[PDB]
């Protein structure tokens, strides 16, 4: 079981790394215009259980890619399996896509590190 739960975390890792090397990649007035939206930090992020900050992000990081439905839809599954279907509490400041996506990629290797 544990090991199968790693290797879920790995391609949720691998996923937002993806999506956050694209956006990297962008021409700077495109990454400008991206950078204005606003995401939802959680307070506290150190259980499994946790991953449920990220799925309720999950539909509005999928609208604002638009703008710039597989690689979200992966995601979605991970998420839904590995915390299992708690009340997220979120931060009082919101971050950008940039700050959001390196949030829960540090997240995922804090978890498979213990």
């Known amino acids: ?3 199968k739960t790693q290797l879920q975390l790995e391609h949720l890792l691998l996923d937002l790394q993806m999506i956050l090397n694209g956006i990297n990649n962008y021409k700077n007035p495109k990454l400008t215009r991206m950078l204005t939206f606003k995401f939802y930090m959680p307070k506290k992020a150190t259980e499994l259980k946790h991953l449920q900050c990220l799925e309720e992000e999950l539909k509005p990081l ?3 890619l638009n703008l710039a439905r597989d690689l979200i839809s992966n995601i979605n599954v991970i998420v839904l399996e590995l915390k299992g ?3 997220c509490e979120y931060a009082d400041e919101t971050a950008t896509i940039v700050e959001f ?13 213990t």
């Not at 996506?101 to 590190?113: A, D, E, V």
């Open 1 to 3: 079981s544990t090991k």
């Open 62 to 64: 999928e609208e604002v």
């Open 85 to 87: 279907s708690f009340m």
């Open 101 to 113: 996506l390196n949030r829960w990629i540090t997240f995922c290797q804090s978890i498979i590190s």
